[PDB]
Amino acid sequence: DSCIQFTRHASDVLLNLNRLRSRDILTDVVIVVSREQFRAHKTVLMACSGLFYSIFTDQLKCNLSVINLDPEINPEGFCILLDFMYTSRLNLREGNIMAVMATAMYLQMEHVVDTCRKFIKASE
Amino acid sequence: DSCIQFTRHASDVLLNLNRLRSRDILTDVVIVVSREQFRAHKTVLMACSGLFYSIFTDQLKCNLSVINLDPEINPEGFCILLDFMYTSRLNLREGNIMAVMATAMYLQMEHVVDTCRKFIKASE
Amino acid sequence: WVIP
Amino acid sequence: WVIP
Ligand SMILES: O=C1Cc2cc(Nc3nc(Cl)ncc3F)ccc2N1
Ligand SMILES: O=C1Cc2cc(Nc3nc(Cl)ncc3F)ccc2N1
Ligand SMILES: [Cl-]
Ligand SMILES: [Cl-]
Secondary structure (H helix, E strand, O other): OOOEEOOOHHHHHHHHHHHHHHOOOOOOEEEEEOOEEEEEOHHHHHHHOHHHHHHHOOOOHHHOOEEEOOOOOOHHHHHHHHHHHHHOEEOOOOOOHHHHHHHHHHHOOHHHHHHHHHHHHHHO | OOOEEOOOHHHHHHHHHHHHHHOOOOOOEEEEEOOEEEEEOHHHHHHHOHHHHHHHOOOOHHHOOEEEOOOOOOHHHHHHHHHHHHHOEEOOOOOOHHHHHHHHHHHOOHHHHHHHHHHHHHHO | OEOO | OEOO
C-alpha cells in the first residue's frame, strides 16, 4: 500500500496498556502462581505467550477469570516475565535467570528463552 | 534498572493484537458509525484514543458492548483510523484526508491530527 | 512519521 | 536484545 507509519506507535500503545494494568483498568483475568495473584489483560498475555494464546483460544478456558499455573512455576520468574510482556524490558540477573528461563519455556516465550540460553552459555 | 530490552517486542505485540482482531478473538465491543459496525478490543481503543480512554474509564460506559459514534463521523475515516491503531500504518490519501483528520480530532488521536495538518498545509 |  |  501507500501508507505512512508512525514509528513510536507500537511502543506508545504498549506503554498505555501497562498504565491500564498499573491502574487495574479493564484487567479481565487473575493468574495464580502458588500463593501469589497477578491481574492482567487476556489479550496482552495471548499476544506474548504461546501458552496463553492456546488457553484463551480454547472454547471453555476463554471464559475463565482465574488461571492456575503449574505449582513448579516460580512467582518472581512469572512477575519478571509479566513486566517484560507489558514493557519489552527483561530484568535478567544471575540470581533469577534459571527461574526466568524455566518460566519462559513453560509460557512459550521463544525470544526470552533465546536470550537466557545465550547469557547462561556466556557464564560457562 | 539493569534490564535488557527486546527491540521488536512492542511491534510483535501489536501485530498479534491485530491477528486476534482479524480472527475476532476476544473482541469485546462493537463501535457503530451510522450503518457500519466495527469489532475491536476496548484496551487497544483506549491505548490509542483520548475519546475511548474517557469512555471506557467511565463507571457506567465501561460495561457497554456497543458504542454509537456521532452521526457526522465518516465510517471510512473510522476504518482507516482503526487499522492505524492496530498496525501503526495510516492510509492517508487526497480523497480521504479531510474525513480522517475530522475523525482523529473527534477520537482525540493527536499524532494523526498532526500529520494530517502537515499534509494539508503542503497542498496549500 | 516515515515511509515504511 | 539491547541495553535500553
Ligand atoms: O514465543 C511465542 C510468543 C507467542 C505468541 C503467540 N500469540 C499469537 N500468535 C498469533 Cl499467530 N496470533 C495471535 C497471537 F496472540 C503465539 C505463539 C507464541 N510463541
Ligand atoms: O492523542 C491521544 C492518544 C491518547 C491515548 C490515551 N490513552 C491512555 N492514556 C493514559 Cl495516560 N493511560 C492509558 C491510556 F490508555 C489517552 C489520551 C490520548 N490522547
Ligand atoms: Cl518472547
Ligand atoms: Cl495518534
